[PDB]
Amino acid sequence: DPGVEIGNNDYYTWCKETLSVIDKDLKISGTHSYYENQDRSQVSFIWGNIFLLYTYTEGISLSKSEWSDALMNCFLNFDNYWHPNYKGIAGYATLPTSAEKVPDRFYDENGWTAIGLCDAYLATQNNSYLEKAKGALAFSLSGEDNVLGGGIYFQETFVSLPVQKNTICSAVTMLSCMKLYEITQDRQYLDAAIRINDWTVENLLDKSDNLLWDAKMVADGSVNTQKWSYNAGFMIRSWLKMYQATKDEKYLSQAKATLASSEAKWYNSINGALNDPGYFAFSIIDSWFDMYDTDKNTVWLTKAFHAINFIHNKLRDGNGRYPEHWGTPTTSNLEKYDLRFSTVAAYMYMRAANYKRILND
């Protein structure tokens, strides 16, 4: 029973507490923008804001009236990161930008954002959210070409990084495509997800453990074989959507094989720890929630609540802050922190609150 794991845990309150501390530490006074880190000297990179977007969006499921304004204010902050036309195409930048400036854009960042904006549209029916979801996803899809036979580049403007195509770009683009396919019923999104998936499985999936390698270098086809939880997790979420859309059992079997291997590699089911950066490992928890949505087996929720309980009860420090990595209990207060460390925890708490509500309905 997940009931045993949920107990009297007030996930909804834990989320609000976490958001309060984030705002205190990192909200830029007089704005709805956030600093990157404890130095409070640079506006945040887009990524930590994406976890806020996800949190407020999920909040709508708990209370539309409580979270609608927060979601809209977040969306309007994202407008600061939107570039309406750089070298012929619109898309989000990693830092605030405007039409007359040169942006630094990433195909993965745009897909992470597209996912959130699709969910925001599903929650609210606000067309402006979907317009940007489509624009962000179009930007991600513009990173796809037949160099290496397919796949999507890490970034628009390579400088110090070698030119490469990356699993996370495949995976967030696939999931975005599947969400927009559900909304629009336009088969071109489904076909894109299938094409990108076929390339990704052929080039970046390790058949020995069903985990995902990180990237493939354009210069020589060499693979970065580092295995990160989020490369598996976003592929699992995508495959589960593809299963729902196609009813082809191959997607479910692949999702289950990759998820089992992800649990074996990263999850200590005894204490609930996830042995990776939180801003990656949360994707395994979202995979468990998707599995519950798929088969209604409550054991998936027991795992999710156990891991989220660990975050609160073992990772949270004496100042209500969160560490980068989820693998080990926190034993002293953090001196350094970036926006994404606590925002991902807030998101997890809101997801947990939602599933607690669903179980008690």
Residue numbers in the entry: 36 to 396
Q: What did the publication describing this PDB structure actually write?
A:
By comparison, early studies have shown GH76 enzymes to be far more specific, with activity only detectable against the extended α-1,6-mannoside backbone present in yeast α-mannans. In this paper, we present the crystal structure, determined by SAD phasing of a selenomethionine derivative, of one such GH76 enzyme from Bt, BT2949. Furthermore, we show that despite poor homology at the primary amino-acid level, the tertiary structure of BT2949 appears to be well conserved in other GH76 family members. These enzymes form a long trough-like structure, which is consistent with a requirement to accommodate extended polysaccharides such as α-mannan.
